[PDB]
C-alpha cells in the first residue's frame, strides 16, 4: 500500500511539580508530527504554533465558555486524575533484582567483562557503581543506559571491562528510591 | 515531578484511532475502539480505578473531523514515513531452561502502522505473544513493544521481523543464546 497517509494527534498534558502544588495544563494539536496550536494554562488562551493553526486559535479564543473550561482543567482534569492515580503510579515502587555475571568482549577471550544486571525496578532513576577491593572503579564502565520494558519496569546492564585476578573481590552497588540503603552484590573469581 | 498525558490519534485512509493515558512514559490504559472497552496495562490498575470508554469514542470522532479539516488546510500534504529502529532483548539474564521473555522494541517511527512477526528458527510463532498499542514519544513519533515468552535453549534462534512503509525491506533483528 502506497496510498498517502494523514495523521492527527492530540495530547492533553498535565505537568505536576511537587505533587499537585504546582500544575501546568497543555492541550496540544499535531498534524503528522507538527504541533500547530496549543492551549497553555500559563497563558489561558490558545496560541498558533505554526501558521496552520491560526484559524483554530482565533476561532477557539472567540469561545469564552471553551476558554473557561480550559482555564479550569488544571483543577477539574489534572488535579483530579492525579488524585485518582497517585497510589499506583506516583507511589509505585518495585525493587531492583541484581545479578552479577562474567562475560567476554571479543568472543572467546578469557572473561574480561563483569556484568551488573539490574532488572524489574520502578521508578527509573537508579545509580549503579562498581568497586574493586573497596575502591570505586570509574574507568572501564560501559552501560546499556536505562531501558524501559514497557510493562512498568526498567532494567539496565552495567559492565566493568576488567581482567579479574584471583582473590580480588568486585562489588556492584545499586542505589534506587525504593531502597533505604544501597544494595550491594559481590563477585570473586 | 511527573507527567500524565492523554494521547489520541486518528489516521487516514486507514480509519485507525487510538486513545491512551501515559504516566511518565508508561501506559496506564488504552481504549479498545472495536470493543468499546477500557484496557488496563496492568491488571491491578482496574481494581484501583475506572474509566468510561465512551468518552474516548467521542474524542476520536472529533479527531477524525479535525483531520479532515487539517488535511484540506494543508493542501493534502501527506505524512513523510520515518522507519523504526528495532532492538531485541530479554527481560532478565538468560539461563538455560529458565523461562524468560524476549522483548522487541520498535521505536521512532511514523505513521503508527507496523507488521511485526516473531520467528523461531525462521518460522513465525504466535503462541503466547503479546504487544502494546502505539505509544507516544515527545518528538511525536511512536514506540511499540512486542513480547515472546520462551524457554532458552542452545537449539533455538529468534528474530523479530518488522515491516513498515518507510523501510525498503523487512527489518529482522536477531537473538540467540551466548
Amino acid at each position: 500500500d502506497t496510498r498517502p497517509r494523514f495523521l492527527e494527534q492530540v495530547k492533553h498534558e498535565c505537568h505536576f511539580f511537587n505533587g499537585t502544588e504546582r500544575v501546568r495544563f497543555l492541550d496540544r494539536y499535531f498534524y503528522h508530527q507538527e504541533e500547530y496550536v496549543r492551549f497553555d494554562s500559563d497563558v489561558g488562551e490558545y496560541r498558533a504554533v505554526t501558521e496552520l493553526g491560526r484559524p483554530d486559535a482565533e476561532y477557539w479564543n472567540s469561545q469564552k465558555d471553551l476558554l473557561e473550561q480550559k482555564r479550569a482543567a488544571v483543577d477539574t482534569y489534572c488535579r483530579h486524575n492525579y488524585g485518582v492515580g497517585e497510589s499506583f503510579t506516583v507511589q509505585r515502587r518495585v525493587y531492583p533484582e541484581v545479578t552479577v555475571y562474567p562475560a567476554k568482549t571479543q568472543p572467546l577471550q578469557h572473561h574480561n567483562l563483569l556484568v551488573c544486571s539490574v532488572n524489574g525496578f520502578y521508578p527509573g532513576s537508579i545509580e549503579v557503581r562498581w568497586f574493586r577491593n573497596g575502591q570505586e572503579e570509574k574507568t572501564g564502565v560501559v552501560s546499556t543506559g536505562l531501558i524501559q520494558n514497557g510493562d512498568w519496569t526498567f532494567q539496565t546492564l552495567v559492565m566493568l571491562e576488567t581482567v579479574p585476578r584471583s582473590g580480588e573481590v568486585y562489588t556492584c552497588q545499586v542505589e534506587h528510591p525504593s531502597l533505604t540503603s544501597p544494595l550491594t552484590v559481590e563477585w570473586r573469581a | 515531578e511527573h507527567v500524565i498525558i492523554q494521547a489520541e490519534f486518528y489516521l487516514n485512509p486507514d480509519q485507525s484511532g487510538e486513545f491512551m493515558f501515559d504516566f511518565d512514559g508508561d501506559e496506564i490504559f488504552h481504549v479498545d475502539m472495536a470493543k468499546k472497552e477500557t484496557v488496563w496495562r496492568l491488571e491491578e490498575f482496574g481494581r484501583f480505578a475506572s474509566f468510561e470508554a465512551q468518552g474516548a469514542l467521542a474524542n476520536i470522532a472529533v479527531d477524525k473531523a479535525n483531520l479532515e479539516i487539517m488535511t484540506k488546510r494543508s493542501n493534502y500534504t501527506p505524512i513523510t514515513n520515518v522507519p523504526p529502529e528495532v532492538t531485541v532483548l530479554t527481560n532478565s539474564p538468560v539461563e538455560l531452561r529458565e523461562p524468560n521473555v524476549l522483548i522487541c522494541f520498535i521505536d521512532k517511527f511514523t505513521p503508527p502502522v507496523v507488521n511485526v512477526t516473531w520467528l523461531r528458527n525462521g518460522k513465525p510463532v504466535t503462541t503466547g505473544v503479546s504487544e502494546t498499542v502505539f505509544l507516544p514519544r515527545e518528538d511525536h513519533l511512536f514506540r511499540k513493544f512486542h513480547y515472546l515468552p520462551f524457554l532458552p535453549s542452545t537449539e533455538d534462534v529468534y528474530d523479530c521481523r518488522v515491516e513498515h512503509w518507510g523501510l525498503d525491506e523487512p527489518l529482522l533483528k536477531h537473538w540467540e543464546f551466548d
Binding site: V10, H12, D27, Y29, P55, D56, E58, Y59, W60, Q63, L66, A73, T76, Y77, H80, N81, V84, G85 | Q6, F19, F21, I28, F48, A49, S50, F51, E52, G55, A56, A58, N59, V62, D63, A65, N66, I69, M70
Partner: peptide, 13 residues
C-alpha cells in the same frame, strides 16, 4: 476512582 477524559473542540470548518 474514575479518571476523566479531557474533551477537545472541533476546528474552524
Amino acid at each position: 476512582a474514575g479518571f476523566k477524559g479531557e474533551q477537545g473542540p472541533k476546528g474552524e470548518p
